[PDB]
Symmetry: C4
Subunit: 93 residues, 4 copies
């Protein structure tokens, strides 16, 4: 779906921005920055908190701005792709 | 009916099994702790443990994106086909 | 609203059950058990995880069963009470 | 329009201010850390810190119940009146 693609591109770009930020300012390895971006914007959460005042402020802003994006993408991911595939199997061809 | 709900239940169970196996082997958690990690992640509660392997972080990211929509679709249908019915149905003479 | 009251009574009973369980099996002070019940069922999360296998299993079950209840109550709390009061102030009597 | 959205924005800001003041005085957090705690709690991300005073736990429980609906209503309207419009409006010739 076109909208689903827009939401994917936006989500990936958001997670790239978060990865870059947290690997630079917080000194995280990229994978750790990606994990933190993912677990922050999806609201799962992790065992670590940001240590720089700049990191804390950015995380606040990143949450409010990316949370809705990531959950719109999760909704479309579940609805235009995961649940329907299984529901195609409910009819025995 | 409770036919879609059954589908979401089986999908959620298999998802939690996959997470259980994954986190028990790669992260060395006991199976109950792997099931707990799978459950608290996909429900977004989270916990004070975080994966230690780069493989575990990559998998957890993908597991989050794919399984939040299933686990919460299951919770939604559990509320709409089992919880909401039993309450209202009892709010009658 | 009648339904709002049903949801409150259910929510309070749920948090009582969780408080009792976690203070007995996990040895938490009641307030700590109440905090854990609250932060678990609302998905905020805390810095501690359950330590007993029994505690872990119960938390899994408690999440799936109480999560929908607590968020239905949060919705009605925001919608039949908090947001509307403020919206009554939007019209200058 | 963006009139209800403005109301949710001001309510969210005042809620975050209240949390900031509360957690800075009773829990001895720096103000930025109190703002962070308020923000990650009400967005349900959570963090590795937990309140130490019994007063802080009681307040946090009430703050969660009252402010999740506001903070997420604000995120919903931010997505529906600011984020969804700017994307689609740009998905035109
Ligand atoms: Ca949520
Ligand atoms: Ca946490
Ligand atoms: Ca921790
Ligand atoms: Cl890396
Ligand atoms: Cl075992
Ligand atoms: Cl106590
Ligand atoms: Cl300061
Ligand atoms: Rb959460
Ligand atoms: Rb969380």
């Amino acid at each position: 779906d076109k909208e689903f693609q827009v939401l994917f591109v936006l989500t990936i770009l958001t997670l790239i921005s978060g990865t870059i930020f947290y690997s630079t300012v917080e000194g995280l390895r990229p994978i750790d920055a990606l994990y933190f971006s993912v677990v922050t914007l999806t609201t799962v959460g992790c065992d670590i908190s940001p240590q720089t005042d700049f990191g804390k402020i950015f995380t606040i802003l990143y949450i409010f701005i990316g949370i809705g994006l990531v959950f719109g993408f999760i909704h479309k991911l579940a609805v235009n792709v995961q649940l329907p595939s299984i529901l195609s199997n409910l009819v025995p061809r």
